[PDB]
Amino acid sequence: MRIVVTGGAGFIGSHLVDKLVELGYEVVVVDNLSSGRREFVNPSAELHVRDLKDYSWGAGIKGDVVFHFAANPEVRLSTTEPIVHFNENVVATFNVLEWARQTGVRTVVFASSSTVYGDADVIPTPEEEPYKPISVYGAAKAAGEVMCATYARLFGVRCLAVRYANVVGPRLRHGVIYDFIMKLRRNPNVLEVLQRKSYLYVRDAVEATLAAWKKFEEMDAPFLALNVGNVDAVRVLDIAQIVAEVLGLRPEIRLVGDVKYMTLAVTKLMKLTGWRPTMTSAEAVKKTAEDLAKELW
Amino acid sequence: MRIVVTGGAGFIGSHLVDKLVELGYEVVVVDNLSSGRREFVNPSAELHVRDLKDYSWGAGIKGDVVFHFAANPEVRLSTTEPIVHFNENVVATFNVLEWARQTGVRTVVFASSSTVYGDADVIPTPEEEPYKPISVYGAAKAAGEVMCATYARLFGVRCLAVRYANVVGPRLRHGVIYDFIMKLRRNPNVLEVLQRKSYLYVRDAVEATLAAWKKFEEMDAPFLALNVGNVDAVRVLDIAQIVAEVLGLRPEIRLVGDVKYMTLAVTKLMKLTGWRPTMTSAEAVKKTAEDLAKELW
Ligand SMILES: NC(=O)c1ccc[n+]([C@@H]2O[C@H](COP(=O)([O-])OP(=O)(O)OC[C@H]3O[C@@H](n4cnc5c(N)ncnc54)[C@H](O)[C@@H]3O)[C@@H](O)[C@H]2O)c1
Ligand SMILES: NC(=O)c1ccc[n+]([C@@H]2O[C@H](COP(=O)([O-])OP(=O)(O)OC[C@H]3O[C@@H](n4cnc5c(N)ncnc54)[C@H](O)[C@@H]3O)[C@@H](O)[C@H]2O)c1
Prior knowledge:
Number of domains of chain A: 2
Largest sheet of chain A: 7 strands, parallel
Number of helices of chain A: 8
Oligomer: homodimer
Protein name (chains A, B): NAD-dependent epimerase/dehydratase
CATH class of the largest domain in chain A: Alpha Beta
Structural class of chain A: alpha/beta
GO molecular function, one term (chains A, B): nucleotide binding
CATH superfamily of the largest domain in chain A: NAD(P)-binding Rossmann-like Domain
InterPro entries (chains A, B): Epimerase_deHydtase, NAD(P)-bd_dom_sf, Sc_DH/Rdtase_CS
Pfam family, one (chains A, B): Epimerase
Family (chains A, B): Belongs to the NAD(P)-dependent epimerase/dehydratase family.
Bound molecules: nicotinamide-adenine-dinucleotide
């Protein structure tokens, strides 16, 4: 079948595209290359440079399933204007749903986020916890989920919403690990750290997403939201230490809408698919620093 | 203080404006006159014809509180294109929140809807029930609430979201009562009916909204969602009968994303404000038919 992956030139999307291609699917990538890169696109995939903010972004594009992963990256949320978060998340997602409805797409796998929970009352956070986002980005992802669930109920466009915790690995060009490497690249002797969160290596995240999608296609529920992340967490200061050692540096650490604590409960995912993380958060962070060192140092 | 009422030239908005004016507030109406009418605007209010779909709709407009009541009317939801529901509800509401944030508005009273609940599992429906909208309009109102609650938590723009059941009274130009009158006007001998819902006379709805707003301004919770509607309900066929009698007609009834059953639990509203409806649903429908008969027959 034909699978459309929006944001397929980006970090998670490009790895997801690689796995779908390895599994034999005909993959179509749609990406505006705002944060993604043509170098990350699998040679076997068909790239279409379109902007999802345009209602007509999908003219001529057909697929049976769409993995809607396009969005501005979840980083430095307070420094981007709210209208950018709104347009790149809510308007883009609505436009994807209208294209899905009008072209008869059967399934939307939406890349959601732990940010829809905001500063959760319960941690590890189960899927039942309410939307209490504290960033415009978080509100935008929650609104996207509400719209997806409604299109599933009303138009039969089924949706699996994957709420990701932090995902890390090769090709990453945003986030705390990338930031620390770039800071040490600027000055290897000092590292400025301005939090405890769960990190999943991208290989694990893609496996979990695809295993969940497979099970979802075997279910008949119109909509399902599922957390995808690791079972543990690491503190920002530990990330800082791991990155330094990978680089063989001994920097002087200097402390100088963002959710402070996050860890999603992944009991539903594990129960539904048998999936298990293959690396701890600390291990996912170390491998990623090693991956990025070769790409950025 | 200065109060801005978007959609103040419309049905609920014009009556809300009348009461705010009667209470002494300086009222500014912003409305694009798409479904509202200049004839409904209180002479004491200041009218600005602007379109909330424009990010800059509020240039030059200042207020301490905004009653955001503008939206396309909640009617014949399945016959309007989804993008219209999306733009008139989600984009407009986001633009109102950005203007509120940038101009330092302290409170947003958002006109939400029973449709955010979809076909509720529990009826009368308490505020705790989840968003399960089945219409794009319902999804749009729920997304609007999520964005409002986030702006309250993040930017301090407090929000009272009023989830209305059906509101009826003078100036109404949409909905089942209006439709039946216009149908009988076309042919007084036959009435085609294509449901059980709660109806509140507009005077009651405006009183409840303002009493809730007063209490909300005395609270410190950033966000509060409150149901506003009657305690009982009437069936479509009863509405049909009431309208006929008001008109002195004896028509032959002929049965030929829309929520089928709705009644909101108003325990929280009554507890918080002491408010009580002054007319039953059947009485609100009869008075409205009498009001509309003079305006339309
Ligand atoms: N990486 C994480 O830890 C993480 C965490 C939570 C959620 N997510 C979600 O996963 C998805 C991918 O994130 P990512 O980390 O890979 O970020 P990314 O920036 O690398 O990938 C996003 C891709 O979408 C593309 N894109 C953005 N706007 C577009 C538009 N208007 N039209 C077309 N393409 C557009 C970008 O160019 C980019 O290639 C996003 O939806 C994001 O919210 C990621
Ligand atoms: N009447 C009901 O029973 C009911 C039920 C549930 C919710 N509501 C809500 O109450 C509010 C008012 O509804 P109503 O019944 O009075 O409908 P209405 O159509 O009479 O009033 C809506 C007003 O908003 C204005 N408007 C629409 N789009 C606009 C835009 N883009 N820019 C500026 N102005 C715009 C319209 O011209 C109109 O005057 C809405 O938000 C609606 O969802 C009403």
